[PDB]
Amino acid sequence: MSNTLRPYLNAVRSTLTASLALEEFSSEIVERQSQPEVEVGRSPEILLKPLVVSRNEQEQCLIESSVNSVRFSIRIKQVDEIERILVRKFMQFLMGRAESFFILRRKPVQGYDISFLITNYHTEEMLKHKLVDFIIEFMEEVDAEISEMKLFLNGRARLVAETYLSCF
Amino acid sequence: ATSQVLHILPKPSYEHAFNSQRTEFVTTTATNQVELYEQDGNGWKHARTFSDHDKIVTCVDWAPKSNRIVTCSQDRNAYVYEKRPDGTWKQTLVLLRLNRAATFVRWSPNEDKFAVGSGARVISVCYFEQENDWWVSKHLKRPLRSTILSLDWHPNNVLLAAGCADRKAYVLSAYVRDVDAKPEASVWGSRLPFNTVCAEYPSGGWVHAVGFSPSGNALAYAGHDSSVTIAYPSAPEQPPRALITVKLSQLPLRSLLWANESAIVAAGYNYSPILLQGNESGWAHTRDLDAGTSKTEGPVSFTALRSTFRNMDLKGSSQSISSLPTVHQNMIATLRPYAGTPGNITAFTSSGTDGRVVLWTL
Amino acid sequence: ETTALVCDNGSGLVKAGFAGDDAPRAVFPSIVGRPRHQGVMVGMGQKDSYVGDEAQSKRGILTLKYPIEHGIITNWDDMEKIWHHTFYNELRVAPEEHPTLLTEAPLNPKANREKMTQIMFETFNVPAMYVAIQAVLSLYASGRTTGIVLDSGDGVTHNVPIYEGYALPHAIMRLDLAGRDLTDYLMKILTERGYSFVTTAEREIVRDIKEKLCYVALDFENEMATAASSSSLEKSYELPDGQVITIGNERFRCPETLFQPSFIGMESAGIHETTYNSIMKCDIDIRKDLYANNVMSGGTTMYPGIADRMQKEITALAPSTMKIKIIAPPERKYSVWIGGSILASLSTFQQMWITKQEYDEAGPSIVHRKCF
Amino acid sequence: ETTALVCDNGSGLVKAGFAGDDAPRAVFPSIVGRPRHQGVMVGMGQKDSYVGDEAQSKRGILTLKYPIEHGIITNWDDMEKIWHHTFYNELRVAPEEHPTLLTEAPLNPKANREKMTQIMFETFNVPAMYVAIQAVLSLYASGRTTGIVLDSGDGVTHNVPIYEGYALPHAIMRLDLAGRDLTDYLMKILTERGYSFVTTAEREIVRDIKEKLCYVALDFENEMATAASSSSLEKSYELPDGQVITIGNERFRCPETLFQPSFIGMESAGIHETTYNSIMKCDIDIRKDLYANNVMSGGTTMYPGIADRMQKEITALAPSTMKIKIIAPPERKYSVWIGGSILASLSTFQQMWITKQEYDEAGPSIVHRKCF
Amino acid sequence: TFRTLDVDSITEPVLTEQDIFPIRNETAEQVQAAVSQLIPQARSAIQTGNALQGLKTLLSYVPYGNDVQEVRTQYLNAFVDVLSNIRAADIPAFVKECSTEEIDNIVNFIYRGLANPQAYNSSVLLNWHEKVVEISGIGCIVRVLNSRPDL
Amino acid sequence: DVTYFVQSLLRDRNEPDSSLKTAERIKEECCYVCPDIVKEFSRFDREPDRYLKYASESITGHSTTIDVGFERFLAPEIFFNPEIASSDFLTPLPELVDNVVQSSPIDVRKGLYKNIVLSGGSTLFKNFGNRLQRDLKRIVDERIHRSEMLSGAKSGGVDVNVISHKRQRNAVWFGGSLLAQTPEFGSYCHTKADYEEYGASIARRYQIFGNSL
Ligand SMILES: Nc1ncnc2c1ncn2[C@@H]1O[C@H](COP(=O)(O)OP(=O)(O)O)[C@@H](O)[C@H]1O
Ligand SMILES: Nc1ncnc2c1ncn2[C@@H]1O[C@H](COP(=O)(O)OP(=O)(O)O)[C@@H](O)[C@H]1O
Ligand SMILES: [Mg+2]
Ligand SMILES: [Mg+2]
Structure with missing residues (x-):
């Protein structure tokens, strides 16, 4: 969790809080319309350069910013394939309820497992000095959950094995 | 310094404007409505709304001399408002002939004409023809390349500083016959036909704002790289004498206002305004006017207790929510003068996404 | 947000109001009184029964009788009349438009609660309702989490000791004196x-x-x-x-x-002694927290000078080491309703209702299934 | 690698920290407790199980179960929960980036060792791990190389005589009183x-x-x-x-x-007679040195005056011609940890780990043929 | 059918990156030679236990461009090695004794080094990033967000 | 919804038992469709043998007969009069079917009217099909005659044949079983390789109702 992820976590925090200087901006190709500019990528003069934060080859933090919208996709550790399946299913459930989260994408960008997307409106109404707090909190708690759920798998396997075998 | 919170708007306000007598002020909100407020003793109260537009209202500016209000919105149309003798206001559409959403509007210091920024590659300048009672727009499309993010007039009433979103600062002559007389020779130039490239200067990001000095012989612009550059022109087709650039360690700046002939106040995503003291030799950040790192046996009311249980239930903390130190809670919109003779300003107002309209008393 | 009626049909008064209100807006005695005279006078539309403040005002020639006896309902028809009065003539809200929140004393007969929910669903066609406990709502209104709540209304006096979250069901002591x-x-x-x-x-x-x-x-x-x-x-x-x-x-x-x-003529210990007995019935660790958190409640406990006597008696009974703190909020008269209103406007609570469809498909035992 | 993990998963208390440190960063009771009530409250963050200091603090409304019984883990679910707590909640270091050192009492079933090694390698994916005996750790901590070690703890008491750099496995006496x-x-x-x-x-x-x-x-x-x-x-x-x-x-x-x-009601020798028998079971030429070096270790040996009485009994049992000396450092409560850290911070110890690449190529039986 | 086959990409040529940032006046051979001259000095300074001076010398000139990929990779490798060969305790003095533009180059290149962790050591880059953000401020990261793509 | 209506009707009469299963069985052996409500009420008032008493035996109430009443014809009428159930819908079923057929392309209206297939377990009410056919036939005759007197010429008209068959209760299952036996059915299924290649959104493009994109 922490006491363990200081430099990576603080680098992500600083980069995210620096990249969240959004602004209301309409569409330069369609009139009377405004769209998240990071997702469309049609006007390159307002798209800041993509930025990547990493701690190890299996952990990355792609930070793509724009004038109004910021997309922030991360990779979390999957040491063994058990954690691979657990991470995939858990993060699918996480993104399946993006309606009540307001900063999630229903489908992550390829080569990743989750992609946040903070449009202007979220910074407009929701005070954003704890969106990053939620970000880092999730980035550590997710590994916590994966470990706990694999423990629960082992426990249930033990219980069912005992229940089956005792009734000879 | 000292600041007083005038009002707490329920919704974000990207703009504000006070009348000449500083009696009532107009402000914009997130939706197509435009809000009016008037004093109620020691506070302010709602006055009326304008629903003439259709899409999000972008900018609003108040003419102090003639007491008129113009409004340019995302719906690619501009409305001009003048109060009737009884007290109500009369709407008036202006055909901007734009192809994309407008972004920023300003009245000339003589209030005869107003220029409109736009994302349709162009800038529209409109005046009034008394012979036809019409507003006609002219497009400035020769040197422009990207979206207009800011506008700034000149005391000579002819030069117009345009802050474009192509990492280049633009100055153009908006002089038009039948409205303005011939202007005097200027350090910026003398021969000033309509739509001439007065000057072009670079930057390290989108030019959020531009501003001429009160003396009218300088330009100050801020990119998105949290750098404010002060330009000192020398002669037409002649590089400036000195291009002073001050680089800060905070979030990018948004709008620039000239405190006096040698002072600039500017605020941005840092939730605070700054001050620049200097001269032709150089400039430097002087002071954080927002107090900096201020970090600012009894019965419990029913509402507080209910809030504690709601936080406990929806949460796992039930603790104070933000307690943010800065007076503002989100990005600031703009800085405009409040009182004082030109070159002598001690009070200036500001608005932000939090809706706070915080007056600043130097 | 999701306003709900909060009806606390106490044994002496019927305190009612919407969820989230600072204080209940409907307080009146729970009395139904029929006339007891021939009434040779004709005209003026003399009604056959009067409920609440009208009954109290006309009590000169009315046979007042409470429809509840020591927390247990005994006059179901009269109680239906009182509920109709509360919904229509005092709150002026249709029952089928807002859910309700009821309270009942601990250790009450199960048929009482079953018939309560059965009537409120079959008759008034309310969307949903919940049957809480007075002590829990008093704990809500006191703004705490632990402590033993002494509740003494018009009908019955009961103590429900509650530690952090958890409530001990084997240490609930109920005394009918009230x-x-x-x-x-x-x-x-x-x-x-x-x-x-x-x-x-x-x-x-x-x-x-x-x-x-x-x-x-x-x-x-x-x-x-x-x-x-x-x-x-x-x-x-x-x-x-x-x-x-x-x-x-x-x-x-x-x-x-x-x-x-x-x-x-009752071979029962007083309130001061039954509180100590209920505390001792609990575990050895939570007793120290229960000693310093005594939540007085109920309308009976409004006697000027009851908290001091109770604290003195509990101090005398208990060991002399730790301190005994008694909590007597000035508004403890309506503490149960305050707690009910606080609980009703909670996001997690909407999943704890008894929806009309669920009752229709489950019968009247759903209140035992879900409420407690 | 900068530092290596080390955990003394004792029966009663668990000691964890980094190699080379002189203070336990984390000591909490080896207790996993589950609630035993209803929880009529709303919210409160209902946690299914409390482990460690949280369980010790909230034992008022919990039932506590020790995972390790008599030095043999009996509830592997609770043991995994405790290890997860040590890794994430208190030390909060990623297991996959730190070799770990474990401790297991002598003469335990091989099932315990194999299961522990397999769990650490697969469920936590540690880089490397090692299993060591308490007596060797006590000798490492005390700075000695010769002397029978009495390790009395919460779960089991055992004696392991060790001459200069060599241990006699046939003279190891283990007593299940603790x-x-x-x-x-x-x-x-x-x-x-x-x-x-x-x-x-x-x-x-x-x-x-x-x-x-x-x-x-x-x-x-x-x-x-x-x-x-x-x-x-x-x-x-x-x-x-x-x-x-x-x-x-x-x-x-x-x-x-x-x-x-x-x-x-158990037929066995006391903690002095067992030590005497353990020494007498060794070679004659080393008893004259084992008598002079009696090592006290473990939490149980913290009683006042235990060392003096044990010295008196051992002197009475042994012949008078050879003196008896018993030693007990004031920090003997964590002697096992101190020895473990000293061993883990040794250059010559770097090649005695069991890496994952070594483990997966030989199965979980590798621990038996490498660790001991 | 006719819904696909977009035509907006050709009728109006959108602004391309060279229209935003100034073009590189230097030639490819010139910058390649300059970097090939600067790198061995940095390696020698690393060898003689003067990594701070080596990093300062290597920081004086910084290459960029879309046609200098290989030489930029060699420069980045040398920079990463030089920075990783620096004692941690002396970082604050180095950071405080720099100009804003030099610190901007430092943070830009360490952040690009963070982008390829399969060949580099991420720990030292993260530690340097933490210390520079702590000392200089957030404006360095702002400049990173508003720097040239080829940098 | 009509089961809830039947339960409410048992509720208002204060019957000894009002369990939902009792309402379901009351439909199972009691309810039938009627031509019109006022005439049926008059017939029920006049005719006294239409007053049945269903034996409940809920759990322990032996011989607690439930006296059924007007529900027997008031319940099925919701289909041909949906105002009773709620205000969310107000168009009677025959009128809605008429709108569905009229919105269809002109050439297939004869085929739509000629063959009408009932399905589901809630269409097993007696005289349901007869009443539906009568109402639809009346409405189509009204429209055709209106056109005729507007123009002044006779026509052959269109017939309506509401069809009920021996597998009304589980027509969906029987059709699925008959369809699955076709060899071409296997090719139409989503193979597991397709799912693992194209992701979990392989079946999201809704196909039967409406055109995608
Ligand atoms: N200020 C007071 N002093 C003395 N007795 C009071 C006072 N207020 C209320 N009571 C008594 O409390 C009773 C009302 O209790 P109440 O709060 O209605 O309990 P419940 O709601 O459970 O019926 C009344 O019978 C009255 O005698
Ligand atoms: N000062 C003391 N006096 C008496 N008993 C103690 C003292 N300290 C610890 N103990 C006992 O010793 C036990 C500590 O066990 P511990 O030595 O941690 O087991 P392990 O060696 O398996 O980790 C505790 O359960 C406690 O009962
Ligand atoms: Mg009460
Ligand atoms: Mg031990």
């Missing part, structure tokens, strides 16, 4: 003074007397001894008729029955 | 004076009583005779309930169970 029994004892002891009160109207009158001319003495034997020099104890009360009453030791003798239930 | 049995005996013999302790919270309270009051006498008969004139031997303790209890001859009686195991 405000109605105190009023009856006051009626009995006013006879020895000379004044006679018999009928129901005189019962309401003596309840009004006890409302403002009674208190709990900090010490009992010394107070009775000093009542011999009757100087600062007695003070007159103006009876409705006009003749003046003058009560001396009766002022503090009738509330003493709470601490000495043997006065009305 | 702190948990002493606590149970104290609970049993506190009943004769009236006080009764039943629930697990009472068991922890009795453990605290043994912590603060129990001590070992010098002569049992003389101490009992002195206690007969019960004047200046009794003490007092304060339960969290606030009640004061008095302790008497059972203050020192229950520590004597170590020297007289017949008190708890």
Whole structure:
């Protein structure tokens, strides 16, 4: 969790809080319309350069910013394939309820497992000095959950094995 | 310094404007409505709304001399408002002939004409023809390349500083016959036909704002790289004498206002305004006017207790929510003068996404 | 956000109001009184029954009778009439538009709660309702999490010790002595003074007397001894008729029955001792927290000077090491309703309702399935 | 690699930290507790299971179960939960980036070692791990190289004589009487004076009583005779309930169970006779040195005056021609940890790990043929 | 059918990156030679235990461009090695004794080094990033967000 | 919804038992469709043998007969009069079917009217099909005659044949079983390789109702 992820976590925090200087901006190709500019990528003069934060080859933090919208996709550790399946299913459930989260994408960008997307409106109404707090909190708690759920798998396997075998 | 919170708007306000007598002020909100407020003793109260537009209202500016209000919105149309003798206001559409959403509007210091920024590659300048009672727009499309993010007039009433979103600062002559007389020779130039490239200067990001000095012989612009550059022109087709650039360690700046002939106040995503003291030799950040790192046996009311249980239930903390130190809670919109003779300003107002309209008393 | 009716059908009053209100906006006695005279007079549309404040005002010729007896409903038709009055003539809201939140005393008969939910669903066609417990809502209103809540209303007195979150169901002590029994004892002891009160109207009158001319003495034997020099104890009360009453030791003798239930002939410990017994019934660790968190509740506990006597008695009973703190909020009269309103406007609560479809498919046992 | 993890997963207490440090970063009771009530409250963050210090603090409404019994893990689910707690909640370091060091009592079933190694390698994916015996760790901590080690803890008491750099596995004596049995005996013999302790919270309270009051006498008969004139031997303790209890001859009686195991009805030699037999089972030429080096280690050996009495008994048993010396450092409570850290911070120890690449190519049986 | 086959990409040529940032006046051979001259000085300074001076010398000139990929990779490798060969305790003095533009180059290149962790050591880059953000401020990261793509 | 209506009707009459299963069985052996409500009420008032008493035997109430009443014809009428159930819908079923057929392309209206297939377990009410056919036939005759007097010429008209068959209760299952036996059915299924290649959104493009994009 922490006491363990200081430099990576603080680098992500600083980069995210620096990249969240959004602004209301309409569409330069369609009139009377405004769209998240990071997702469309049609006007390159307002798209800041993509930025990547990493701690190890299996952990990355792609930070793509724009004038109004910021997309922030991360990779979390999957040491063994058990954690691979657990991470995939858990993060699918996480993104399946993006309606009540307001900063999630229903489908992550390829080569990743989750992609946040903070449009202007979220910074407009929701005070954003704890969106990053939620970000880092999730980035550590997710590994916590994966470990706990694999423990629960082992426990249930033990219980069912005992229940089956005792009734000879 | 000292600041007083005038009002707490329920919704974000990207703009504000006070009348000449500083009696009532107009402000914009997130939706197509435009809000009016008037004093109620020691506070302010709602006055009326304008629903003439259709899409999000972008900018609003108040003419102090003639007491008129113009409004340019995302719906690619501009409305001009003048109060009737009884007290109500009369709407008036202006055909901007734009192809994309407008972004920023300003009245000339003589209030005869107003220029409109736009994302349709162009800038529209409109005046009034008394012979036809019409507003006609002219497009400035020769040197422009990207979206207009800011506008700034000149005391000579002819030069117009345009802050474009192509990492280049633009100055153009908006002089038009039948409205303005011939202007005097200027350090910026003398021969000033309509739509001439007065000057072009670079930057390290989108030019959020531009501003001429009160003396009218300088330009100050801020990119998105949290750098404010002060330009000192020398002669037409002649590089400036000195291009002073001050680089800060905070979030990018948004709008620039000239405190006096040698002072600039500017605020941005840092939730605070700054001050620049200097001269032709150089400039430097002087002071954080927002107090900096201020970090600012009894019965419990029913509402507080209910809030504690709601936080406990929806949460796992039930603790104070933000307690943010800065007076503002989100990005600031703009800085405009409040009182004082030109070159002598001690009070200036500001608005932000939090809706706070915080007056600043130097 | 999702306003819900909060009806606390207490044994003496029916406090009602919407969820989230600071105080209930509908308080009136739970009385249904029919006329008891021939009424040769014709006209004026004389009704056949009066409920609430109208009954209290016309009590001169009305046979008032409470529809609830020690927390247990005994006059289901009268209680349906009272509920109809509360929904329509006092709150002026359709029952089928907002959910309701009811309360009932612990250890109550199960048929009471079953019939309560059955009536409120079949008859008033309410969307959903919940049956909470008075002590839990009092804990809500006190803004705490632990402590043993002493609740003493008009009907029954009960203690439900609650640690952090968890409530011990084996340490709930319920004592039937309550405000109605105190009023009856006051009626009995006013006879020895000379004044006679018999009928129901005189019962309401003596309840009004006890409302403002009674208190709990900090010490009992010394107070009775000093009542011999009757100087600062007695003070007159103006009876409705006009003749003046003058009560001396009766002022503090009738509330003493709470601490000495043997006065009305009950082989039960007083409230001060049953609180200690309920505390001792719990685990050895949570007792220290329960000692310092004593949440007084109920309308009976509004006697001026009850908290001091209770604290003194509990301090005497308990070991002398740790401190005994008693909590007597100035608004503890409506504490149950305050807690109910606080609980109703909680996001997690909407999943704890009893939806109309669920009741229709489950029968009347869904209240036992879900509420408790 | 900068530092290596190390965890002393003892039966009663668990010690964890980094190699080379001189202070346990994390010590919490090896307790996993589950709630045993309903929770009529709303919210409160209902947590399914509390482990460690949280369980010790909230034992009022929880039932506690020790995963390790007599040095053998019996609840692998709780053991995994405790290891997860150590890794994430208190030390909060990623297991996959730190080699770890574990400790297991001698003569335990091979199933314990194999399962622990497999769990650490697969469920936590540690880079490398090692398993070491308590006696070797005690010798490493004390700085010695020769001397029989008495390691008395919460779960099991064992003796492992070790000559200069060599251990005699055939002279290892293991006794299943330990702190948990002493606590149970104290609970049993506190009943004769009236006080009764039943629930697990009472068991922890009795453990605290043994912590603060129990001590070992010098002569049992003389101490009992002195206690007969019960004047200046009794003490007092304060339960969290606030009640004061008095302790008497059972203050020192229950520590004597170590020297007289017949008190708890088990036929075995005391902790001095077992040491004498363990030394006599060794070669004759090394007894003259093992006598001079008696090492006391573990939490149980913290009783006042235990060392003096043990020295007296060993001197009585052994011939008088050769002196007997017993040593017990004041920090012997964490001697096992100190030795583990010293071993883990050794350059010559770097090639004695068991890497994952080594483990997956040989199966979980590799620990038997490498660790010991 | 006719819904696909977009035509907006050709009728109006959108602004391309060279229209935003100034073009590189230097030639490819010139910058390649300059970097090939600067790198061995940095390696020698690392060898003689003067890594601070080596990093300062290597920081004086910084290459960029879309046609200098290989030489930029060699420069980045040398920079990463030089920075990783610096004692941690001396970082604050180095950071405080720099100009804003030099610190901007440092943070830009360490952040690009963070982008390829399969060949680099991420720990030292993260530690340097933490210290520079702590000392200089957030404006360095702002400049990173508003720097040229080829940098 | 009509089961809830039947339960409410049992509720208002204060029957000894009002369990939902009792309402279901009351439909199972009691309810039938009627031509019109006022005439049926008059017939029920006049005719006294239409007053049945269903034996409940809920759990322990032996011989607690439930006296059924007007529900027997008031319940099925919700289909041909949906105002009773709620205000969320107000168009009677025959009128809604008429709108569905009229919105269809002109050439297939004859085929739509000629063959009408009932399905589901809630269409097993007696005289349901007869009443539906009568109402639809009346409405189509009204429209055709209106056109005729507007123009002044006769026509052959269109017939309506509401069809009920021996597998009304589980027509969906029977059709699925008959369809699955076709060899071409296997090719139409979503193979597991397709799912693992194209992701979990392989079946999201809704196909039967409406055109995608
Ligand atoms: N200020 C007071 N002094 C003395 N007795 C009071 C006072 N207020 C209320 N009571 C008594 O409390 C009773 C009302 O209790 P109540 O709060 O209605 O309990 P419940 O709601 O459970 O019926 C009345 O019978 C009255 O005698
Ligand atoms: N000062 C003390 N006096 C008496 N008993 C103690 C003292 N300290 C610890 N103990 C007992 O020793 C036990 C500690 O066990 P521990 O040595 O941690 O086991 P392990 O060696 O398996 O980790 C506790 O259960 C406690 O009962
Ligand atoms: Mg009550
Ligand atoms: Mg041990």
